[PDB]
A paper describes a structure:
Using a suite of thirty environmentally-isolated coliphages, we demonstrate multi-layered and robust phage protection provided by a plasmid-encoded defence island that expresses both a type I BREX system and the novel GmrSD-family type IV DNA modification-dependent restriction enzyme, BrxU. The BrxU protein contains DUF262 and DUF1524 domains, and shares 13% amino acid sequence identity with the single polypeptide type IV restriction enzyme GmrSD. Here, we have shown that BrxU is a promiscuous enzyme that uses a range of nucleotide and metal co-factors to recognise and cleave DNA that contains any of at least three different modifications, and this activity is dependent on the initial nucleotide-driven dissociation of BrxU dimers, and subsequent nucleotide hydrolysis. Our BrxU structures are the first for the GmrSD family, providing the highest resolution detail for the widespread DUF262 and DUF1524 domains.
In order to better understand the biochemical data, the dimeric structure of BrxU was solved to 2.12 Å. These linkers entwine in the observed dimer, and then a loop from each N-terminal domain connects with the corresponding protomeric C-terminal domain (bridged by a glycerol molecule in the structure), such that the dimer is, in effect, two interlocked circles. The relative rotation between N- and C-terminal domains is easily observed from a top-down view, and generates a cleft that runs diagonally across the dimer. This cleft is ∼21 Å wide, and surface electrostatics show clear patches of electropositivity throughout, with the N-terminal domains as the floor and the C-terminal domains forming the walls. Within our structure, the position of the γ-phosphate has been taken by a sulphate ion that is bound by R102, and nucleotide binding has been prevented by proximity of an α-helix and linker from the opposing protomer that fill the corresponding space where a nucleotide might bind, also blocking S42 of the RLFDS motif. Within the C-terminal DUF1524 domain, D474 and H475 of the BrxU DHIYP nuclease motif are positioned on the surface of the DUF1524 domain to form part of the cleft wall within BrxU. A glycerol molecule bridges the DUF1524 with a loop extending from the DUF262 domain, and an additional sulphate ion and chloride ion were observed bound by looped regions of DUF1524. Despite setting crystals in the presence of AMP-PnP, no nucleotide ligand was detected in the structure.
Residue numbers in the entry:
A (entry chain B), B (entry chain A): 1 to 25, 29 to 583
Write the structure that this text describes.
Amino acid sequence: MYQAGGTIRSLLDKVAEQEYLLPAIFVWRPEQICRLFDSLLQGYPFGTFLFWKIKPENRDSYQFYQFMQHYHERDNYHCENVTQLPEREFIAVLDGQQRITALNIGLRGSFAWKLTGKWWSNDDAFPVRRLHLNLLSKPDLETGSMYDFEFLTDDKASLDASEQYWFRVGRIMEEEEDALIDEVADDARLSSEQRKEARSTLRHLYRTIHDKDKISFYEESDQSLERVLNIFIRMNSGGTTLSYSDLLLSIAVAQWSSLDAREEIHALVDEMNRVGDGFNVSKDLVLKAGLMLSDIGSVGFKVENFNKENMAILEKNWTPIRDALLLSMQLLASFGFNAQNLRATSAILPLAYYLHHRKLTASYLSRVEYAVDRECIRNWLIRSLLKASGIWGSGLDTLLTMLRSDIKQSGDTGFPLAKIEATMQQRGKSLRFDPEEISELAQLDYGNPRTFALLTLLFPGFDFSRHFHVDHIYPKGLFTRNKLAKVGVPAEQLDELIEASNKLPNLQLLEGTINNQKRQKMPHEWYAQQWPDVNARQAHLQSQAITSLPEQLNQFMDFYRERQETLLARIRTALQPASS
Amino acid sequence: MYQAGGTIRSLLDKVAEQEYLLPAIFVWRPEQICRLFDSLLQGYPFGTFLFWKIKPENRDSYQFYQFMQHYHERDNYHCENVTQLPEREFIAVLDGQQRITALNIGLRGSFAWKLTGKWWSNDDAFPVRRLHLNLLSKPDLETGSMYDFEFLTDDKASLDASEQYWFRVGRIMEEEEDALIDEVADDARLSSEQRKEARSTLRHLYRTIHDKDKISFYEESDQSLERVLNIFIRMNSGGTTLSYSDLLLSIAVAQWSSLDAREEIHALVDEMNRVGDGFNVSKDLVLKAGLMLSDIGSVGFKVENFNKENMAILEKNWTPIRDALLLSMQLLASFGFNAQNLRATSAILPLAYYLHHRKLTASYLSRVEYAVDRECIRNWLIRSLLKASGIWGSGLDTLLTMLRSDIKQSGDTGFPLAKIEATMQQRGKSLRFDPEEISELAQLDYGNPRTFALLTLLFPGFDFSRHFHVDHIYPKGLFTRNKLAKVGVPAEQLDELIEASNKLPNLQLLEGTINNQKRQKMPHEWYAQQWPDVNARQAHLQSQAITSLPEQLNQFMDFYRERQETLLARIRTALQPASS
Ligand SMILES: [Cl-]
Ligand SMILES: [Cl-]
């Protein structure tokens, strides 16, 4: 069947009573849910959906799932199983799943994502947020946004937003339009001009969902599913549309006399990703690096930059360029980076420009004449990566072309560290750390990608190309609620000790792989038998910012505070910028 | 910038002027184009298209193509490059490519595909067809069809069938509606009752194309492209809509406790395709085989057959089922089959059923107790593949379930050939060949997949799992039109002899690979050099149905005609209905 128009309200009511379901076959980023609601209010139409009608004889023939509603990046990213399996004929959605999920999360659910820089262990790193609309939206002529939608905690919404009036979008499914419009009219915090504007935005939102025929679908049973599914694919977007990424790639490879630049680019990606313990770089990175290493004026990942003259330059230099790219990954692996602990792939671009510039080869990793230069790059890269945010995000393209001029100007004197650091300061991307950034670094968690990076900056000396790991000084296994309450730790200090045992003051770098006999002893026990000479012992331990090793867990927080103090100092000096 | 109105005629005028072009980045089956036109006349709407505007300053920055128009499976199957590049702003179509191509082929172009049973080398196996509509179509209740569209020759369109009035669709782009409707009204082929419904169907077809707003699109320049493409993708089918067959795979994987069904399917498929010199088998075949080998009542490739009860039965029997499937591929390779010469992969299903029924293993290929049985299978299979069509196409599912009962009753006595052939006969699929089929077999071309099969039937005794090939008796290279006139062949006959030189009476099976010294000699020279003893030579020529080996090409047709008669007698004997 064809249904040419239903409301979003009718659609979501069916989702609510589990009459629209999913067959057993992910979710969008919050920013994309917001772009959908903005596009919806602006008037962009939905494409048609496709629904498979399940008769009651078949309720049990197949496994069905429920549309995602309250998304939690940690605790609920999988679709929930059906709980109210209908006993009348119902629907499984074959096309429309992600648009319907976003509608459902925005209007009936929530989104809890991990805060930037925090670790999965942290429980206050996943604040629950709900979709909100700023009833006083004004056209942002940069994003093309007409309505400002945003996922907000309850308190960032309720705060006095100056010039803003935030409205929880889901209220239009819970209250009548009259009650909501009256709330806005009766709010004395709005001016009369603001009240008029808030009112027509709230009406526009309410009625887009409740009055406008936005939803169209085909609806078919088992018997003719095959035929209409084919019709549906034929007449709508059947052969999937290229993303912008894949469009640039196709346009870019079109300009190459090599009969398969597509194959050259994939071989390079997979090669790069097999380096060391594995990386995860994309073809986007390779194409942008193409633009950057060929001295193209713009490194913007934009279709206009992949015209035939620029792709002619890129093809000419493809061998130097894939050589530098591949040597960039080998440098990174030689520092200990892999796919799990490299947060910003864009940092590869200036590294690769440098290696490509000086025409370096894999001997750059061994010869001693380079060791000082290799160490200067490592320190710079790690510091850039220790920033929670604000270095390799927004503003990248202008940062990259300025860093490129600095590297160009350096001839073969080596990595131009002072110049680079000044360019970054000039751009609002200083590698200077302020005291609260320092405190944040000193409480990093085991497994956070910045943690090993920080440790290899604080305690250099290992061959980071060889095996090494981060270990707990007081083994993490000793720290459970049961075990601790019997050594006497008060019941209220129990969660404090457990959280602290997993953080930087209890962390160290160790050569080799995980030692299982170290992890079953108290640290003073383990170090007394590995270092019988009491003087060696206290020099080794001191090299690791370990002064003492209390013999009972009851005194762990004394140890923690003491080493936290030493690490704060060591972090300060390590992150202090040189001068001349 | 949106545009919800647009006629198909406007769209195709832009294609015709080369103002709608393709960016550099396959064409549908003719029956899929026909189904597009049927859906279009039934009211199924087109999804919205995405167009990228190229400003005249960038008309040279990228490579563009023209929409395909006159499709030739051999001589013109990849997009035409741009003649007549617009000097004003123009469009590259980013979404809608395939739907526009189909409109363009149906309304302004043509489709030439290889006739079933013929080979690429034959220049009269690709008759040009153009899209036609039966102005007397009536609802077909078996196909959901309402309008019968079909690609036809001018000759088969000019034929009078009881209620078949074929009208060439492209004429609505070339002539005024008045002229076309008057020709229908003036045609003594139609009764007054029929000219009313033919006029109404011609008008509906004409006006769907010229008056109705069926085309809608977004149009964007470089600047808005990224933003609007992502909106387009989010609001429409954003994830590649799953085909019916990918839906079945997903439905099926979901019901397996833990054999990790998705990659056990793909792994078995890859395994199947690497047997011998390689096959090209589909996951769809593997699923169908699951249904047949587990004795499910229906073997229809329909979603209803993949409920959890059936998938439970399949998972239990998965190991014996993949065993049987791989053994069936190994048996086929032992016959000399591969991806190129196996025309009907459905023939695998009864093979695999049989092999699974008797629980045979790899020793079935070698032990001599099976030699007679393997040869009976090979003989039956080849005969089924020697039919140009009508065996493994339509009607397959009922044939399969009946072949299954025949194999199941055969117990352990061996392949039940007589009963299988009775079954095939009552299904209208006799392995009996009539005189005109015999004559067509006696002139198959070199390279036609049926030629190798026929030869292995007529000349058994090689080790078809070791290397062998088809070779010309009088080498193919001797037969160029310059070379032939020089040995003094009359002008009239020259191309009769070139023709016949590529056909079965000049073909033989030889062990090993191509022998380049044999291909440079007249046959009688080759054989006198290889078989110095004239009596062993006559014996060996006799085994290949060679009576005489004329020494001049001038007598080649005397050889052709003599060996053709010898082959006809062998073929008539090899294909004759058997003893009972
Ligand atoms: Cl940027
Ligand atoms: Cl069938």
